[PDB]
Design a protein around this ligand. Sequence first.
Ligand code: HEM
Ligand code: HEM
Ligand SMILES: Nc1ccc2c(n1)CC(OCc1cccc(CNCc3ccccn3)c1)=CC2
Ligand SMILES: Nc1ccc2c(n1)CC(OCc1cccc(CNCc3ccccn3)c1)=CC2
Ligand SMILES: C[C@H](O)[C@H](O)[C@H]1CNc2nc(N)[nH]c(=O)c2N1
Ligand SMILES: C[C@H](O)[C@H](O)[C@H]1CNc2nc(N)[nH]c(=O)c2N1
Ligand SMILES: [Zn+2]
Lengths: 411, 407
Amino acid sequence: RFLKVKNWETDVVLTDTLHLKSTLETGCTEHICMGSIMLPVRTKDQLFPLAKEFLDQYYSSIKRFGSKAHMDRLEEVNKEIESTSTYQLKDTELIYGAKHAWRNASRCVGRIQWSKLQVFDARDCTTAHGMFNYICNHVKYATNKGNLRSAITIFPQRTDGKHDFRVWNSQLIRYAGYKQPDGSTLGDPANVQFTEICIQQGWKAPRGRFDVLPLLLQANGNDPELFQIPPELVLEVPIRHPKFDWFKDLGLKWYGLPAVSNMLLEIGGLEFSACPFSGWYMGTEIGVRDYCDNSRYNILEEVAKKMDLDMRKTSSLWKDQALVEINIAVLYSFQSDKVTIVDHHSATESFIKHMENEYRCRGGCPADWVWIVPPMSGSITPVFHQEMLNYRLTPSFEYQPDPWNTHVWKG
Amino acid sequence: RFLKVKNWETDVVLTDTLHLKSTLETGCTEHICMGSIMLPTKDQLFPLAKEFLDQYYSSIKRFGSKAHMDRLEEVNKEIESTSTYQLKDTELIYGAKHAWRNASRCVGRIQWSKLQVFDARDCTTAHGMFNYICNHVKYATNKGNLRSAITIFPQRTDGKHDFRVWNSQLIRYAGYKQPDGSTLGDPANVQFTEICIQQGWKAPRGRFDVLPLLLQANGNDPELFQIPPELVLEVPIRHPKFDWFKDLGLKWYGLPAVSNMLLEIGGLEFSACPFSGWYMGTEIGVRDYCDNSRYNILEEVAKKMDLDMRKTSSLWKDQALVEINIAVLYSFQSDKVTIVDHHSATESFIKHMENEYRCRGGCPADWVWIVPPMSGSITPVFHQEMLNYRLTPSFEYQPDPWNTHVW
Ligand code: HEM
Ligand code: HEM
Ligand SMILES: Nc1ccc2c(n1)CC(OCc1cccc(CNCc3ccccn3)c1)=CC2
Ligand SMILES: Nc1ccc2c(n1)CC(OCc1cccc(CNCc3ccccn3)c1)=CC2
Ligand SMILES: C[C@H](O)[C@H](O)[C@H]1CNc2nc(N)[nH]c(=O)c2N1
Ligand SMILES: C[C@H](O)[C@H](O)[C@H]1CNc2nc(N)[nH]c(=O)c2N1
Ligand SMILES: [Zn+2]
């Protein structure tokens, strides 16, 4: 069964066959669409089918399907599962798996880069101190003095679920948030709950508006431990505007390196619960969401006042006007400091090219329109007018519950 | 099975049971979501009519009354004999308001119960259609105090006798290819503007030529009718700060009146049911003016603002887009024409959703269409989870008549 999608601005039509390789479920049915729902322990029973499918994929990609290298690997994995109840990926399989989990991330507009991913194998890690060292090296490598490089670091896979490696931070670099007695919030409101855990675990909080959070690292199911990232590794950019001199006086900065650390990487049935990865920012992540979301820094009002906008009625679009200037300042500041960043016009244009290329060479490109379209100026980007098919391929990145809600404390 | 939707900006959680009353299919499966796809006999008729009469008499708190059961057998006998049936005026008004209420792609549905229904089922000719349409336009326009209205022409009988308004909206600007190569006027209406000329229309060949109406009664050839200009309220577009904005020579009409959709009530199909409300600002400013496939005046505006158009990272398009949309709102508001900005409209819809979860058990909603085409995340609906499902009565798409009509 072939499926077509249409770009309604160019009339280009594309044919998806790759959705036939879709295993997982979307959450949708014939009678309901959960397209906008934000979120819609494994035995030897189902593992070898999951492993064989991944290995079939792996050996297809290298043009050795059905070879003796392929059949022996299948046999090897079979005997390892039936006797050890799990198995270990070769280095080549891990690299392929990580790259394809990114390739398969239907919510990711940056997937034109998916094949230039630097994979750090940290499966020999055993302790939190060891995790910190692997994360420090990730951050240094990925940052590259502002010439950002995509990287993932993969910690040991889950076994019985009682010995998990987890990074308790949602991103490796994030600012603290502090609920004040008067109901206001100092710093990033997104991070208040994590900040409180850190403070309870012994972190001395500087209690400023842009304090880099410590790393809270869990090795082998042990209680997590605190580590401070060396500040010389945390590249930050002061935010100024090319024409508004008062903008620097808002005292804003952001960090250079977006590095998501709370997701789960699934490869051939194995679960890598700690797999922090990083690329580089699209400016609207900072300028639109991080600064202008009502539940975040919410500097829209203050930028609006300083611009002297008509703030009495919303139909003056003072919010829209302030949001554009903030986003201009974010891109100006990063480019002025030679830190890698991409505006939403460039990134969505690249995604369309990637997606057409993926339809031609792969037969499909799963894509989540709700997440691909940028949070500002949606329809003047080319993805807005693009029909998109969303379906789940493996290897994949998955959500997982926050570890402080599942963790058994040792004391 | 009793589904939850979360607002991530406010943690408000709503519980949806109305989706279990859903009947039609979404185009999605558990293996693939089609949420971003633009378009996915005598015996099926009595179940359909029963469903609709069941909710109708429930909505007036007379479910299982003699009147209910009498109407049910009455319609059943009508179907057995005449192979169709006719709606009472009250059921017709109900079905129209609820088709709007069920329109999961419509952000303006907080207004759904104030719809003015014009029963035009006695109409038999295109001249008759034109008359009903002129009355509609003048009622809905209300000298700029816009009012929602629908006009319902006779229902389909056998596909041979369809009533159809060939225009996509009652009021739309003409578009022409140039010998030079580009497009003068509205590019979305190029093929229809051609059908009109290739029908007998004499185009002024301007930028903002109000298209004539092309009306089809009882399945005959359609006929051209010029809507009287004094019924077509237009707003000249100026900017409240930039005096050079007037010189761009832009205007838009005040009445969005969609006329190519099909209204389905109790299994009956109304192929001609033009309806009208009022504009959200971004429909004109973002889509009509700045889509590359439309008027696409973004570069000219940014140029006139002396913005650095050399790299995309200056966000010159974004800066221009906002000014254009400030101008549309300022123009309509100054001329006392109803218009809503995307901030007000989405805030209304969140309230409307809360109302529907409270008083109805849910509200079908299509996030891809509810979220405005600019400034998405600073509006409350961006952070709102929504469940999309197809309830009936409903407005449906139908093929363009010029691909179907036996000429
Ligand atoms: C290199 C530049 C990259 C850019 C510009 C980029 C851009 C984005 C953006 C804007 C989002 C949506 C997040 C939001 O708006 O809240 C996203 C999601 C995502 N990205 Fe990328 N990305 C990049 C690299 C990567 C890499 C290296 C990986 C993994 C190896 C990755 C995997 C994902 C995943 C799994 C999601 C889904 C998030 C979720 O489901 O919540 N991306 N990306
Ligand atoms: C009164 C003020 C109204 C506002 C502000 C409004 C707003 C909107 C907007 C912005 C859209 C998306 C259109 C686009 O992006 O081009 C839409 C779609 C729609 N509206 Fe409303 N609308 C209003 C009234 C009505 C009325 C009176 C009806 C019918 C009686 C209606 C039925 C629909 C339908 C069926 C759709 C979706 C059409 C489709 O599936 O493509 N609307 N509306
Ligand atoms: N420039 C780049 C480069 C790479 C990546 C990103 N950006 C962004 C990204 O995703 C970032 C994200 C944003 C919102 C919610 C989540 C999901 N995690 C928390 C949560 C909160 C609320 C509801 C559900 N889930 C994750 C992954 C990779
Ligand atoms: N202010 C108001 C008030 C009421 C309404 C509207 N606005 C707007 C509206 O419909 C807005 C629309 C937008 C794009 C495409 C379509 C559908 N046109 C047919 C088509 C052709 C080709 C591809 C896809 N679809 C419709 C209905 C009612
Ligand atoms: C590809 C996508 O289905 C198409 O461009 C849609 C996206 N969302 C939209 N949303 C609204 N309100 N109106 C539209 O015309 C569209 N177009
Ligand atoms: C309700 C909705 O699913 C949710 O707010 C989504 C919408 N689309 C998004 N798109 C991106 N890129 N990032 C997001 O966090 C979200 N949030
Ligand atoms: Zn779906």
